Amino acid sequence: FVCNTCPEKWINFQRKCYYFGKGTKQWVHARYACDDMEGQLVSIHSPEEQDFLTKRASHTGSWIGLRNLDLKGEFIWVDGSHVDYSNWAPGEPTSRSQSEDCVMMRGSGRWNDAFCDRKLGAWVCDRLATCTPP
Amino acid sequence: FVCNTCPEKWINFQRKCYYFGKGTKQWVHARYACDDMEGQLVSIHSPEEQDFLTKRASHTGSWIGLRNLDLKGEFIWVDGSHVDYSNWAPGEPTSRSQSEDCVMMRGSGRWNDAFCDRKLGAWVCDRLATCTPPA
C-alpha cells in the first residue's frame, strides 16, 4: 500500500492530505468546516510537516488543531495526540485565557495562542491519504 | 429525422430542450413546475451538455433532477437514468440528509448535495426536442 492519494483541492505530504481553507472563522467554526470535508483541523508532528505547511500558509494567520484546555492541563491536538514537535513564536505560548486557549499559525509558520473567538481568515485541515492497492 | 425543434420559451441543445426557471422553489416544487410544462428536472449526461448548462447557470444555485433516495441507494435522475457523467464539486456528494438528498448546480456548473427543502432561486427543466420528418 502506497498512501499518497488526495481528493480534489487537497495537497499530499507523506501519508496525509491537507486543505488550505479561506474565509473568516473562529476556531470551532474552522473545526466544523474541517469536519464537513471529512478532515480535521491540522495536527503538526514534525519540522518537515511544518515546513510543508509554512510554504502554503496564509499570510494573515490560520487556525490549527491545537488547544490548551484546563481539563487536560496541557496542549492537545484535535486527534488526541499530545504536543511533541512545536513551533512556537518567540515568547509563546502565552496564555490568553487561563481555561481555554486555541492556537494559530502565522504566515511565518510560527505558532501563538489566541482566544478561540478570534476571527481568522484561514484554517488548515488534514486527513489521511488513501492507498493504492498493491 | 433531425431532432432540434423546441417549444416556445425553451432552448435547444443537441436533441433536447431546456427551460431555465427563476423563482424561489424547494426541490419537489421545482419538480412539479417542470412537470407542469411537460418537462422534467434536467438530467445531465455529457461534458457538452454540462457546458451548455454552466453557461446559463444561475449564480445563486439551481435545482437539477438528481436525487439520492436511500431506497435505490444511489443517485438517480428523475427520468430514471443513472449517473454516467458527473460534475460534483470538490468533496461532493457530502450527504446532508440521513435519507433523501437532492442535488443542485452551482453557478460554476458543479453539483452539490442539499436538503430537499432548501429554497433556491432557479431550476432547470428538460424535454426531448421534436423531430423533422425526413424530407
Q: Does A22 touch chain B (CB under 8 A)?
A: no
Q: How many CA atoms lie within 13 A of B100 on its CB side?
A: 6
Report whether B48 belongs to an annotated binding site: no
Question: What CA–CA distances, in Å, run from B45 to A97, B66, B82?
Answer: 55, 11, 9
* Cα gap A113→B22, rounded to integer Å: 48
Task: Give the whole-angstrom CA distance, residue A124 versus residue A43.
Answer: 9
CB contact (8 A) between residue A36 and residue B94: yes
Q: Which ranges in chain A belong to alpha helices (H)? A: 27-36, 47-56
Resolution to one decimal, Å: 1.5
| Chain B residue with Cα closest to A35 | B94
- Dump strand ranges (E) for A10-128: 11-13, 16-25, 40-41, 62-69, 74-77, 100-105, 111-115, 120-128
Residues 6 or more apart whose CB falls under 8 angstroms from that of A10 comprise A17, A18, A19, A127
Domains defined along chain B, listed by start? 9-129 (3.10.100.10)
Backbone Cα Rg of chain B: 15
* Contact residues, chain A, for B92 at CB < 8 Å: none
**Residue reference for cell 445563486:** B60
Strand, helix or coil at A40? Answer: strand
Chain B residues touching residue A36 (CB < 8 angstroms): 94
Cβ-proximal residues to B108 (8 Å cutoff; 6+ apart), any chain:
B54, B57, B89
For residues B116 and B102, is the Cβ–Cβ distance under 8 A?
Answer: yes
Residue A7 exposure: Cα atoms within 13 Å on the Cβ side: 16
How far, in Å, CA of A19 to CA of B46, rounded? 29
Q: CA–CA separation, B33 vs B41, rounded Å? A: 9
Give the DSSP letter of residue A57. -
Q: Which three cell numbers stand for residue B115?
A: 436538503
Task: Please tell me whether B92 is known to bind a ligand.
Answer: yes
At A23, which amino acid appears? G
Q: Are B92 and B31 in contact, with CB atoms under 8 Å apart?
A: no
Picking from B22, B59, B24, B21, the residue whose alpha carbon sits closest to that of residue B42 is B21
Distance from CA of B39 to the nearest CA of A (A): 34
C-alpha–C-alpha distance, residues B120 and B20, integer Å = 13
Count other C-beta atoms under 10 Å from residue A64's C-beta: 25
The C-alpha cell 487537497 sits at A10
Handedness of CA B123, B128, B130, B134 (dihedral sign): positive
Contact B79, B45 (CB under 8 A): no
Q: What is the largest CA-CA distance in chain A?
A: 50
The type of residue at A132 is: T
Which parts of B2-129 are beta strand (E)? 2-5, 11-13, 16-25, 40-41, 62-69, 75-77, 100-105, 111-115, 120-128
